[PDB]
Amino acid sequence: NKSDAAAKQIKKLEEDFDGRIGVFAIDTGSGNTFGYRSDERFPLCSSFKGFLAAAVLERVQQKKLDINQKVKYESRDLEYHSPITTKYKGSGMTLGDMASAALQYSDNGATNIIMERFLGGPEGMTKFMRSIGDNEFRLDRWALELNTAIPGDKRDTSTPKAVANSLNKLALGNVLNAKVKAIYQNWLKGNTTGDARIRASVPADWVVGDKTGSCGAYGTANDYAVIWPKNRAPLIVSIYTTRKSKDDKHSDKTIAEASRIAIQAID
Amino acid sequence: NKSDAAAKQIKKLEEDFDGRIGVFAIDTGSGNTFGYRSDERFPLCSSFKGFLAAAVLERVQQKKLDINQKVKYESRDLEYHSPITTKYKGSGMTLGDMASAALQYSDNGATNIIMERFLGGPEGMTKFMRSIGDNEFRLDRWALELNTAIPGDKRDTSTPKAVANSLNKLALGNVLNAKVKAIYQNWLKGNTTGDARIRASVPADWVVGDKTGSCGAYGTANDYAVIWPKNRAPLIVSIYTTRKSKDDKHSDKTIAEASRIAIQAID
Ligand SMILES: *C(=O)[C@@H](NC(=O)/C(=N\OCC)c1nsc(NP(=O)(O)O)n1)[C@@H]1NC(C(=O)O)=C(Sc2nc(-c3cc[n+](C)cc3)cs2)CS1
Ligand SMILES: *C(=O)[C@H](NC(=O)/C(=N/OCC)c1nsc(NP(=O)(O)O)n1)[C@@H]1NC(C(=O)O)=C(Sc2nc(-c3cc[n+](C)cc3)cs2)CS1
Ligand SMILES: [Cl-]
Numbered sequence: 314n315k316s317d318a319a320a321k322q323i324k325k326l327e328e329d330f331d332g333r334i335g336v337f338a339i340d341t342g343s344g345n346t347f348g349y350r351s352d353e354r355f356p357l358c359s360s361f362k363g364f365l366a367a368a369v370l371e372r373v374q375q376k377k378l379d380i381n382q383k384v385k386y387e388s389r390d391l392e393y394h395s396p397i398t399t400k401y402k403g404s405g406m407t408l409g410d411m412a413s414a415a416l417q418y419s420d421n422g423a424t425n426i427i428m429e430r431f432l433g434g435p436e437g438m439t440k441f442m443r444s445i446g447d448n449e450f451r452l453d454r455w456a457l458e459l460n461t462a463i464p465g466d467k468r469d470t471s472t473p474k475a476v477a478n479s480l481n482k483l484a485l486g487n488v489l490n491a492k493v494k495a496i497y498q499n500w501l502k503g504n505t506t507g508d509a510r511i512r513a514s515v516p517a518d519w520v521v522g523d524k525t526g527s528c529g530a531y532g533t534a535n536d537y538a539v540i541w542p543k544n545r546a547p548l549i550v551s552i553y554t555t556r557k558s559k560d561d562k563h564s565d566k567t568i569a570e571a572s573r574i575a576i577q578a579i580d
Numbered sequence: 581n582k583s584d585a586a587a588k589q590i591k592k593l594e595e596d597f598d599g600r601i602g603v604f605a606i607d608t609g610s611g612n613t614f615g616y617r618s619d620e621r622f623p624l625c626s627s628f629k630g631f632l633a634a635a636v637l638e639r640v641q642q643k644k645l646d647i648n649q650k651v652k653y654e655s656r657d658l659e660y661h662s663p664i665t666t667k668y669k670g671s672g673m674t675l676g677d678m679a680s681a682a683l684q685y686s687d688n689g690a691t692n693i694i695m696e697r698f699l700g701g702p703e704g705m706t707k708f709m710r711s712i713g714d715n716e717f718r719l720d721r722w723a724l725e726l727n728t729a730i731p732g733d734k735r736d737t738s739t740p741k742a743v744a745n746s747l748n749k750l751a752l753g754n755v756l757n758a759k760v761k762a763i764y765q766n767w768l769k770g771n772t773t774g775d776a777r778i779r780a781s782v783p784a785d786w787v788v789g790d791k792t793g794s795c796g797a798y799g800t801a802n803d804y805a806v807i808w809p810k811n812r813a814p815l816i817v818s819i820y821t822t823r824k825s826k827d828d829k830h831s832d833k834t835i836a837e838a839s840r841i842a843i844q845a846i847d
């Protein structure tokens with residue numbers, strides 16, 4: 314009856330900005346959840362990089378790769394939005410730095426390099442997610458092409474709930490061992506791109522790890538986070554948005570507001 | 581406290597048969613490892629043919645060779661223990677069949693022929709392994725000469741850990757593409773020489789792919805395997821053994837027992 318209220322405010326927010334909002338949120342201390350369109354598909358945009366970095370750390374743990382192995386790509390032309398990979402291009406990067414770059418700055422060259430050499434492309438990235446029991450997620454395209462966000466299109470999408478479930482598995486569950494999870498968590502905590510999204514919805518003295526996506530068409534953007542409040546157990550929050558026209562800008566405030574509503578609801 | 585125990589059992593087994601046992605094992609599902617003498621050198625014996633097979637499939641993937649190209653050797657005197665190459669000698673074999681034969685029956689002529697025409701000799705075979713980041717392994721002689729297994733001699737040796745690492749890279753990693761890997765895995769699954777070694781250490785309904793070697797001096801024999809349990813992730817097990825006196829026979833039961841101990845330990 315007050316979880317119907319939260320759904321009502323999400324409705325009004327989607328109506329206000331003429332688009333579609335999907336939310337899932339879990340309070341891991343109590344198990345209360347809140348969903349709105351939590352089983353509908355949204356474009357992932359850059360948000361899959363947060364899982365991609367998890368996959369790299371999993372192959373480190375499986376001893377297939379070394380976190381300090383050097384990765385050299387002097388010959389490569391770098392994708393648009395490659396801030397870190399551009400500045401390291403003379404000297405190569407460690408695997409760990411390239412992986413955190415893909416996550417903490419949404420670096421496209423970093424993503425594509427890791428996917429081509431280590432993960433088996435978008436198919437391998439999808440298979441990774443199947444392996445932790447995520448049945449929704451699908452990655453079909455490489456980093457620059459998967460941000461088209463065309464209404465009705467199911468390529469490169471998941472659901473809010475599935476992103477939440479997977480983040481909860483990787484950041485708080487048992488896919489990664491204690492040491493490798495701590496690195497994953499720290500990677501998420503140092504993300505640089507999410508200050509106006511889920512982070513903006515919470516008190517400054519809480520600790521937030523997140524990954525954003527911004528498709529740059531159809532006002533499509535998203536954010537997922539693990540949240541550590543003071544003296545309580547972790548929350549998981551996952552917000553996906555799209556808008557009607559190709560030319561619509563995304564809305565960070567709509568995300569932060571949906572996040573705020575979702576946190577109240579799981580409380 | 582229970583990983584020291586596993587080391588203790590390996591000790592007793594080496595003392596029991598008066599020789600030296602080297603073990604490395606990975607559980608890819610958890611990343612737990614187990615080593616005993618895992619950084620000591622042991623003779624490879626025929627066990628390098630499993631990597632030689634991988635090398636051939638890599639040049640197939642590079643389209644340097646065709647898997648169905650005919651390989652003709654009417655002119656040649658065959659090495660001792662060439663069961664498959666002897667039976668095809670009149671008509672030649674496909675590259676792929678020669679390669680699988682080298683692996684599944686430990687065919688010496690097949691090995692030597694491939695190394696002499698396609699892989700650039702013991703030097704080329706060693707360089708192959710450097711190319712996947714295996715820095716230990718060295719092949720110095722051709723197929724029959726490398727089986728002398730002389731105590732203290734470092735020619736034609738590797739370490740349990742390095743063999744384990746490389747198998748994991750080749751059989752489960754991303755040196756081979758999805759299609760070519762599956763062939764490699766099938767080759768390994770149908771090995772015929774390994775029934776009394778690692779295979780004997782595991783429940784019948786698990787799937788096992790392996791490659792053995794038997795130097796036939798100094799009781800030196802070994803086996804490495806990729807292991808697929810029902811409803812768990814792959815294991816990698818690598819067991820090397822040596823004995824004191826020239827005339828000592830190898831012990832398949834010691835291998836199977838070391839394997840059994842190693843599997844429990846990574847669990
Ligand atoms: C590589 O290890 C190969 N081994 C050998 O060539 C030699 N000895 O093997 C004897 C145990 C060898 N090298 S040089 C030499 N004599 P020299 O004059 O220099 O003193 N002899 C091949 N690999 C293997 C292997 O273990 O893979 C073997 S042992 C085999 N067992 C079977 C088998 C066993 C059981 N079952 C049910 C079926 C088949 C096949 S090969 C020897 S050849
Ligand atoms: C993934 O979502 C995103 N990738 C993109 O590369 C595109 N984003 O467009 C911008 C909205 C894109 N790919 S294809 C394309 N155009 P085309 O029509 O030519 O195919 N555009 C990467 N991720 C993110 C993200 O949100 O994670 C973004 S947004 C971003 N902002 C920052 C930032 C903001 C604020 N501060 C204080 C610091 C940093 C960094 S990345 C774009 S890149
Ligand atoms: Cl209003």
Ligand SMILES: [Cl-]
Nearest residue numbers: 316346347348
């Ligand atoms: Cl709900």
Ligand SMILES: [Cl-]
Nearest residue numbers: 348349350351
């Ligand atoms: Cl819902």
Ligand SMILES: [Cl-]
Nearest residue numbers: 358359456460
């Ligand atoms: Cl992207």
Ligand SMILES: [Cl-]
Nearest residue numbers: 373379380381
């Ligand atoms: Cl490491």
Ligand SMILES: [Cl-]
Nearest residue numbers: 391392393457
């Ligand atoms: Cl580009």
Ligand SMILES: [Cl-]
Nearest residue numbers: 449451467468
């Ligand atoms: Cl689908």
Ligand SMILES: [Cl-]
Nearest residue numbers: 512517519521
């Ligand atoms: Cl914050």
Ligand SMILES: [Cl-]
Nearest residue numbers: 393528529530
């Ligand atoms: Cl553009």
Ligand SMILES: [Cl-]
Nearest residue numbers: 592593595596
């Ligand atoms: Cl006893």
Ligand SMILES: [Cl-]
Nearest residue numbers: 615616617618
């Ligand atoms: Cl060791």
Ligand SMILES: [Cl-]
Nearest residue numbers: 621732733734
């Ligand atoms: Cl030695």
Ligand SMILES: [Cl-]
Nearest residue numbers: 716718734735
């Ligand atoms: Cl050496």
Ligand SMILES: [Cl-]
Nearest residue numbers: 766767769770
């Ligand atoms: Cl077969």
Ligand SMILES: [Cl-]
Nearest residue numbers: 799821830831
């Ligand atoms: Cl032995």
Ligand SMILES: [Cl-]
Nearest residue numbers: 831832833834
């Ligand atoms: Cl025996």
Ligand code: NA
Nearest residue numbers: 325326328329
């Ligand atoms: Na309103």
